[PDB]
Ligand binder design. Sequence first.
Ligand SMILES: CC(C)C[C@H](N)C(=O)O
Ligand SMILES: CC(C)C[C@H](N)C(=O)O
Lengths: 231, 232
Amino acid sequence: RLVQLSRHSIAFPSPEGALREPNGLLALGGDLSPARLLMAYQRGIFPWFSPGDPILWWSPDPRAVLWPESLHISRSMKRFHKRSPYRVTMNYAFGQVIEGCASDREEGTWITRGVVEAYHRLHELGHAHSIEVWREDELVGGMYGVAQGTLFCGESMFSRMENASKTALLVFCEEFIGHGGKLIDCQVLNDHTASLGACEIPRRDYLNYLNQMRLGRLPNNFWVPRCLFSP
Amino acid sequence: RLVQLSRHSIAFPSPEGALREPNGLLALGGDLSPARLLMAYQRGIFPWFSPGDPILWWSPDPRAVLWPESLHISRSMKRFHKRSPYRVTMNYAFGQVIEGCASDREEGTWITRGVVEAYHRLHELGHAHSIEVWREDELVGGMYGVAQGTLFCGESMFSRMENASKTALLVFCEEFIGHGGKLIDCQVLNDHTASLGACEIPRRDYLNYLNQMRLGRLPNNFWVPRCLFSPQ
Ligand SMILES: CC(C)C[C@H](N)C(=O)O
Ligand SMILES: CC(C)C[C@H](N)C(=O)O
């Protein structure tokens, strides 16, 4: 299997052909052009690879996902948010947010300048979005991802101050479900993501949901840059 | 005659009182704010002016239009599309399409940073849409415009590869016709648009349709980003 892409085509092989180990490895090569990424997200595929390696494309089985309404907020966090010291915005500083996720030397080490430029293009074309957390005038956290109708693909999140991440995710979810949102894609289940309510589901089911929710929509102004939470 | 708009009011004068030559010159000034732009379209007025000049608003008589079903496709163009090398999408890259038209260097030269931002806002707001044509991984054409119910005002289109904009309009028309689309506004006829089957009707007639179709409605999700046609 494992198809090798090229500049001559933006089409990917079927997700069902992905490898078992590593989980979901479907293709390598191509580029991070706006059209190829959209095609990918449209088919439940996403790019991830370490700096120095060719572009690797995935669609694991199972797929880690998060039902907005199932977001788990600790009793402590709720008390924290009740008197939150942060304010949350939407699409105010995408560059800073993705650069925030990049600078942390962990899972975000895969975010190279090439990746940053690629997603900043999707954000400029209106498909990639960011939620920003502010402490005074400083960005202390947030998250970003690619929208797919009523489905949201969460690429990553970062935090430079206690409870910043949870805040962005807490408020976003309220906003999301409040206006039609139905699902958040987390790709691969991990400890932190699992502690927040993320659960695994068969890839085939994820695909069902995806081509089902990508043709849906949220209010015309749902992604317009604005303030989301401010006491 | 012809009025100076004000940053104060977002209202327009009766299109029927426009000049004959230059055809349709109705007003000047104002700004390109969403509210005002959206209002002009509602009234069958559109902005057009060269860099350096003040905003100019127009409503020509006659008006150029295109009945979707009457789109003319040559026999060799059908042969081409039958085995098409292009991919067509909706709202995948409005900014790139508009910049593509601005780069035309013929008359896309009126499209300044200001005009681009103004139409970008209407896109952000969901009133302006684009149709992209891809060849492999490259954007080779497309068109963008403002939706007005079952009426669509085609602002402009561009081509970087043979038959690109024709397949853009061909695929769009099929999509548009299939879900309730009634008319495409072309503003002012030009050899190319004329070969595609566009024609001229009296301004009072166009306005008549406009006021009828702006009430019409297409599927609630007609404009969400998606692929409309995939090559083979
Ligand atoms: C919303 C989150 C699931 C985003 C990203 N997948 C992460 O693990 O941080
Ligand atoms: C897109 C076309 C059908 C209309 C546009 N005004 C043009 O002449 O390019």
